[PDB]
Each structure stands twice: as structure tokens, then as C-alpha cells.
């Protein structure tokens, strides 16, 4: 089964370089090209370039001068490197393989690599309780950088009535996200509720009990 698995940073500083490794399985690099295509919120999907079966590369016109793709057939790896990053290179980066030889219908995609381009520093979030007075309760995951933060409730045992919102960008330059869950009001005294917050870029893990 054809799979592509990406590795690579999260945060890249401006004017510095971005490198992603795409490790493939279920096919042969000598038989198929591997493309790199990115997705910015305000740019939709954008094809960046491809390293073909034969080792030749093609780079999309805006990136011809700052993009490098190499590969190791034996190690099933494709190496994406892009130089001179700016703020508007912030995007999710994908490698992809097409359905058929030489073509461009991307039937297979890497899982994506979220690349933030910012000169700021990584900061772990602070977590505060949102308590009830059917009742709702939650966690405020405030002032972290960069994205993403993952949140579960009761270590994943409670996935009913849970809504974890899109982060918002605070003028402090930090993200803030809230996650809430609704439960029967009769459960506030008897059931304990813990939000599990994980900010992987800063290795920050927090477990917070929320109660009246």
C-alpha cells in the first residue's frame, strides 16, 4: 500500500531554511516522481515542484531559485529544502505521488507538515478553568506559540459533547484556544473532568481538573 510520511520542523525563522523529509513506502522511487505542493489558508493549494523518477527536478516558477529536492532511492526518502523563507511561506507542506506514471492526479499525499514562518519564540500555554453555575465546562488554553495544540478530555475517555475551537491569534503574537464540553448538570458533583493539553513544539503537557 502506497504511503508517504513526512518529517520536518514546525517553526522556521525568516531568511533561514525549511527542510522536510518524505519517507515513502509501498512503491519505488525509481518508478515514480514525488511532488511537493503546499496549502496556505489564503492561497488554497499550490504545486511547488517535483523530483522525477529519473532524478531530474522541476520547480514551479516562483521557487526555481530557492528550492532544492534530492532523493535516495535506496532509503525511500525525498528531501525538500527551501531557502530564504518569509512570513507568507507559512503553510501546510505536502509531498504527494500521482495515481499513474508521469501524471498529476495526486492519489497519494503525505500527512502534511505545518510550517510557521516567524522570528518569534516558542512559548508553552497557560491553562485556566472555565467552571459551570445541562451544564457546560471547559479549559482556556492561552498564550502559546506556535500552533498546534492538541486537547483531549479525561485522556480521550470523554469525546461526547466536546468542542475544541480553532485557535485565535492574540495581538501579543500568541495563540489562544478554548475547549469545552457539555454534560448533564447532575454530573458536576460526582464525575471528575480533566482536560489534557499538549503543546508538542514546547514539550508542554498539562492536566487540569475543572470543578465549581
Amino acid at each position: 500500500q502506497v504511503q508517504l510520511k513526512q518529517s520536518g520542523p514546525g517553526l522556521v525563522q525568516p531568511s533561514q531554511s525549511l527542510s522536510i523529509t518524505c519517507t515513502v513506502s509501498g512503491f519505488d522511487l525509481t518508478d515514480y516522481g514525488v511532488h511537493w505542493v503546499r496549502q496556505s489558508p489564503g492561497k488554497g493549494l499550490e504545486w511547488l515542484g517535483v523530483i522525477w523518477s529519473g532524478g531530474n527536478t522541476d520547480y514551479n516558477t516562483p521557487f526555481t531559485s530557492r528550492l532544492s529536492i534530492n532523493k535516495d532511492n535506496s532509503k525511500s526518502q525525498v528531501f525538500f529544502k527551501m531557502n530564504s523563507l518569509q512570513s507568507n511561506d507559512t503553510a501546510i507542506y505536502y509531498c504527494a505521488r500521482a495515481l499513474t506514471y508521469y501524471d498529476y492526479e495526486f492519489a497519494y499525499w503525505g500527512q502534511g507538515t505545518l510550517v510557521t514562518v516567524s522570528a518569534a519564540s516558542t512559548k508553552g500555554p497557560s491553562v485556566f478553568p472555565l467552571a459551570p453555575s445541562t451544564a457546560a465546562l471547559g479549559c482556556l488554553v492561552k498564550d502559546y506559540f506556535p500552533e498546534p495544540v492538541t486537547v483531549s478530555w479525561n485522556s480521550g475517555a470523554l469525546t461526547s459533547g466536546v468542542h475544541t475551537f480553532p485557535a485565535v491569534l492574540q495581538s501579543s503574537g500568541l495563540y489562544s484556544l478554548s475547549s469545552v464540553v457539555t454534560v448533564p448538570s447532575s454530573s458536576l458533583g460526582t464525575q471528575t473532568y480533566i482536560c489534557n493539553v499538549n503543546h508538542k513544539p514546547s514539550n508542554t503537557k498539562v492536566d487540569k481538573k475543572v470543578e465549581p
Partner: protein, 609 residues
């Protein structure tokens, strides 16, 4: 004796049963005297409580609740002083020692508990408890508390061993003749004030005794109702100060004793500090520092703010932080010594996106006013433009320059709007060079002799591109006429390095209130020291000849021997543990009251009584 603090967790469980047990054991293992409370809770069946055999006193209360252990061997506990209660007025409370498993506390052999100085006793829901119901608490508890008592007994988990025939009225704490209740109150003769070692009049205890005695002296008590000094039982530890009729001042009592629990020690136990009132405490208060006097550690209230040292910029919490900024400034509160460097950069005032740190409110810099010592360097690249001096460091005494900026400067003040450096306390710069550049309004830097400040050779000063020495002179921004030629930190007479005349506090003045001012003063080594308030100001003559009430020319109110006092000594302790009372005569001179004048005397003899 071996002491321990005890606990105050009341019914709180600490972790699991085992953890809780472990912390209980850790607390009371080898304890003889519990200064606080003895709390025994959640001890499950088969756990070993044998170390409890060591306990002989509980100053606070004893709470024995929720245990499943069959036996709690408090065999040597003689007294519970009840200096603290548990609920209501109970000094001993044994509650609910059973569980779902229908197994509970059976034996509580307190065969030596003969005295409960204060408080009542509560016994509730102990289905397995045996024998305690026989006990005649009238011998144990003070009559004042018999009314607030709560004793409920009901055996339903098992049969109980019977008492020995030798027990009085069949009252015992458990099986055997050794567990019989010893009576030392209810069986005493009417003549007896308190306890007794027998029914006879000869067999009678000294009033200062608790629980019992071996003889009739105040040194033969089993436990002291109030304090124990070596072997004798006393009302209160011999005071540290006594009034000495000879010197007329309070002298150190050679026979002085500190208080520690209900004991009177000559020196506090290890790690204990003596308070400002003679008591032994584990650690000094917030308003006080620790010191050593005559080998005994003592607490002394801090003159200014208590010495508090914190890491410098880039060290500790401030690691990787570039400057004192809006976030970190909070942590410098009450800091007296900075262990490392201080950076004050433009990035602080502009705010910094990259570190997500907002602009600093310049007012916050006042936090630094407590800083007297910086071991590393002081670097100021930015300062509030409307502030004319470096005010936050006005109390800064020393910069050591152990570490220097670029390994070179210990003091760097560059391109600020300041007119003066206002470093009125800066007395020493141990190492590193001093650079002052680019301050268009800076005016006094030059007048200072920096070689005085320097502690090492090789230290140089680089004062460049500031306000024109000529323009300084021209616009009157020079040193105050009260300053010594040694220069100043600003125009004020407090900014002088040293005075041309004399000083009062930190300020240089032309004269002392030698003959005319309201708080009269004397001069010592060019310093104006106020006269004792009891010295009456002298028209056209000096008011005092030194510090103290003996160096007065004339007294303002009354005289006791050689001293001037606002009032005569009244009710002050003296030798022979008697109170000292004096009266004032027509010439306002203090003289001892007739020994019979219990509450004082307005005049001499029995007459003035």
C-alpha cells in the same frame, strides 16, 4: 527530652493508608513530647503503633479517629495540656474507630494519663473499644470542663477483658494490674490543694504539680502544671531582664531562662531561634533576621527591608531574558541584593514582539528601590526621559563587578535624557570599568572622584560626550555649597559625597541643632545625632553630651538614679521575683515604694497606700 511538633491535619487523610501511616511514623517515631497535637487516624489493622509508647506529653490535643488497629499503645502519655482543642472544647477526642469490615479499635491503654490541664473528652462510636468506660474522668479532667463532656460507650464487636480486683472502683484502662487507674485527685484529703500520692495528709503534692508526685516539693512533680526549670516547677521561666536597684536600669538576669514548650531552657535546642520575647521558634518572622549573640541565635527585627537576594539578568528565572522588562520586573519585589547583572535596555520600554513581552510601565522601576548591592554589573541603555536622575538605584550602595559587560564594564550609563546620576548611596565599585556616554543633559559625573569608589587597580573611568562641563557651570548645575570638594551626584545637599560641615541623616547641613533646634542634637565625628527625648532642651547651652538618658544636662520629666525617664518604674520585674514600684517626690526623683505597696504608692511609707 526528645521533642516533636505533631500535626494539625484533623480528619485529613494523606495519600493512601500506607503513605499516611508512613508520615505518621516519620512524625512521631522516638517522640517523647508533642508540642503540637497528637493525631492518630486511618491506621489500618495489623499496623505497628509501638513507637507511641515513647510519648509522655501532648501540649495540644489528642485525636484518635477512624482506626482499624486493635491496639493503640499510648502507655506513657501522662498529660495532655490542651493548649489547643479539636472541636468545641475537647482536648482528647476518640471517634469512629471502626469500618465497613466491622473491625475496630479495641485497646487504648492510657494507663498513665492522669491529667488533662484544659478541655473536655469526647468518645463517640467505638464499637470495639474496651474497658475505657470504667475510667473515673473526675480524677483526670478539670471540674470546669465536666459539663462539656461527651462520653458514649457501646461494645458490639466483641467481649472485653475484665479489670483487676486491685483497681479502684473497678476502673482500669485494660487487662492486668498494671493498667489500673491511678487516682491522684478524687482520693485526696480536703487539706490538699491539688494532686496527691496518697490519702494521708503527709502524702500531698506541691501546688505546681500535675498528674502526680513522689514527694511534697515543687521539684517532685511528675509533670509541671505550668513550667519546668531543670528540676523545679515554676510559674514562669525566670525573666531575661530584671530591674537592678543598684544601676537603676534593666539588667540581664544571670539566672535567666528561655521558654520552650512548657520547659525553661538556658539555651535553645539546635536550629531554634530566640524571639524578641524569649520564646523558642523554628524560624524568624518576616520582619526579622537571624543573628548570633553570646552563642545563642536570636531574632532581630530588620532595620530596613530584610535582606533578599535574587538572580541577575540571564540567571535563574531570568535566564535567556534580555533585560529587566514588563514580565520579569515583578520578581524583583523586595530584592536587596542582585546576584549577577542588571540590564535595562530600550527593548524594555519599546516592548518586544519576538519574546511576546509588552512595553514596561516606567513606574514599575520603583521596584528596584530596595536594591543595595549588585554583585555583577549595572547596564543602563534606556531610562524614562522625563526622570532627571537614576532614581530606582538611589539606595544602591555597591556594585561588585564580579562579572562585567563584555568582561569590561561594571557600570555603563549610555545616552539617556537624565541630568544627574543620583547614585547617592554608591560607595563602592569593586571591579570593572565605568563608562558614561551620550547623555546630553548629564551634569555632575565629572565632580566625582571615581578612584575613591574603585576597589582594584586598573579600573578606569570613561566619561564622554555628556553635557558640557562649561555649560554645567554656566547653568548653575553644580555641586551644592554644603558639599565637600569631593563632588556630588546632583544639585541637592543629599547628593554630596561628603559634607563641608556636618550631616543629619543622609543630608549635608551647615550646623547642628546644637543650641537652638527643636530636636536637640550633639555632634559626633561630623554627624548630628539627636538627643534623647527625655533630655530637656537647654537655652543658650548644649542639651546633651551624648547618646542616652544619662548624658542629659537636664531631665524633661522624671529622674531614676542617673537616668532621665518619662515615668518612674512601675510593675517592672526585679530580683527575688518581686515587682518593683517607685514614686516621684517634689523634686521628681524616683524612690522605691514601701514593700507592702502591692499595687503601687503615690508617696512614701504605708501612708501613700
Amino acid at each position: 527530652k526528645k521533642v516533636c511538633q505533631g500535626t494539625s491535619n484533623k480528619l485529613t487523610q494523606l495519600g493512601t493508608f500506607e503513605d499516611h501511616f508512613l508520615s505518621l511514623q516519620r512524625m512521631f517515631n522516638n517522640c517523647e513530647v508533642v508540642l503540637g497535637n497528637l493525631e492518630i487516624t486511618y491506621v489500618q489493622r495489623n499496623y505497628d503503633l509501638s513507637f507511641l509508647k515513647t510519648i509522655q506529653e501532648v501540649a495540644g490535643y489528642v485525636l484518635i479517629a477512624l482506626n482499624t488497629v486493635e491496639r493503640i499503645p499510648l502507655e506513657n502519655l501522662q498529660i495532655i495540656r490542651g493548649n489547643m482543642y479539636y472541636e468545641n472544647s475537647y482536648a482528647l477526642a476518640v471517634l469512629s474507630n471502626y469500618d465497613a469490615n466491622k473491625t475496630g479499635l479495641k485497646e487504648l491503654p492510657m494507663r498513665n494519663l492522669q491529667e488533662i490541664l484544659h478541655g473536655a473528652v469526647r468518645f463517640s462510636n467505638n464499637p470495639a473499644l474496651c474497658n475505657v468506660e470504667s475510667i473515673q474522668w473526675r480524677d483526670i479532667v478539670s471540674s470546669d470542663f465536666l459539663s462539656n463532656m461527651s462520653m458514649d460507650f457501646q461494645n458490639h464487636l466483641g467481649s472485653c477483658q475484665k479489670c483487676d480486683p486491685s483497681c479502684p472502683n473497678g476502673s482500669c484502662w485494660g487487662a492486668g494490674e498494671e493498667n489500673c487507674q491511678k487516682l491522684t485527685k478524687i482520693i485526696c484529703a480536703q487539706q490538699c490543694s491539688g494532686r496527691c500520692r496518697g490519702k494521708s495528709p503527709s502524702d500531698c503534692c506541691h501546688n505546681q504539680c500535675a498528674a502526680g508526685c513522689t514527694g511534697p516539693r515543687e521539684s517532685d512533680c511528675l509533670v509541671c502544671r505550668k513550667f519546668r526549670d531543670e528540676a523545679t516547677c515554676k510559674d514562669t521561666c525566670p525573666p531575661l531582664m530584671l530591674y537592678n536597684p543598684t544601676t537603676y536600669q534593666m539588667d540581664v538576669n544571670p539566672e535567666g531562662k528561655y521558654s520552650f514548650g512548657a520547659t525553661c531552657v538556658k539555651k535553645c535546642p539546635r536550629n531554634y531561634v530566640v524571639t524578641d520575647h524569649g520564646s523558642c521558634v523554628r524560624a524568624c518572622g518576616a520582619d526579622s533576621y537571624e543573628m548570633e549573640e553570646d552563642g545563642v541565635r536570636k531574632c532581630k527585627k530588620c532595620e530596613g527591608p530584610c535582606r533578599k537576594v535574587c538572580n541577575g539578568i540571564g540567571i535563574g528565572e531570568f535566564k535567556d531574558s534580555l533585560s529587566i522588562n514588563a514580565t520579569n520586573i515583578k520578581h524583583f519585589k523586595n530584592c536587596t541584593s542582585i546576584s549577577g547583572d542588571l540590564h535595562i535596555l530600550p527593548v524594555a520600554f519599546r516592548g518586544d514582539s519576538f519574546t511576546h513581552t509588552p512595553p514596561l510601565d516606567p513606574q514599575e522601576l520603583d521596584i528596584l528601590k530596595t536594591v543595595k548591592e549588585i554583585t555583577g554589573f549595572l547596564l543602563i541603555q534606556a531610562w524614562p526621559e522625563n526622570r532627571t536622575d537614576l532614581h530606582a538605584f538611589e539606595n544602591l550602595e555597591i556594585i561588585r563587578g564580579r562579572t562585567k559587560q563584555h568582561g569590561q564594564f561594571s557600570l555603563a550609563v549610555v545616552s539617556l535624557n537624565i541630568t544627574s546620576l543620583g547614585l547617592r548611596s554608591l560607595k563602592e565599585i569593586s571591579d570593572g570599568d565605568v563608562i558614561i556616554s551620550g547623555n546630553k543633559n548629564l551634569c555632575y559625573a565629572n565632580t566625582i572622584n571615581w578612584k575613591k569608589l574603585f576597589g582594584t587597580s586598573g579600573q578606569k573611568t570613561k566619561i564622554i560626550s555628556n553635557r558640557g562641563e562649561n555649560s554645567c557651570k554656566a547653568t548653575g548645575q553644580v555641586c551644592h555649597a554644603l558639599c565637600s570638594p569631593e563632588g556630588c551626584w546632583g544639585p541637592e545637599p543629599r547628593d554630596c559625597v561628603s559634607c563641608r560641615n556636618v550631616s543629619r541623616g543622609r543630608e549635608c547641613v551647615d550646623k547642628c541643632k546644637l543650641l537652638e533646634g527643636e530636636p536637640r542634637e550633639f555632634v559626633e565625628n561630623s554627624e548630628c545625632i539627636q538627643c534623647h527625648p527625655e533630655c530637656l532642651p537647654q537655652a543658650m547651652n548644649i542639651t546633651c553630651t551624648g547618646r542616652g538618658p544619662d548624658n542629659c544636662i537636664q531631665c524633661a520629666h522624671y529622674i531614676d538614679g542617673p537616668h532621665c525617664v518619662k515615668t518612674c518604674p512601675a510593675g517592672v520585674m526585679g530580683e527575688n521575683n518581686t515587682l518593683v514600684w517607685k514614686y516621684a517626690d517634689a523634686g521628681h526623683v524616683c524612690h522605691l515604694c514601701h514593700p507592702n505597696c502591692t499595687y503601687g504608692c503615690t508617696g512614701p511609707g504605708l501612708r501613700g497606700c
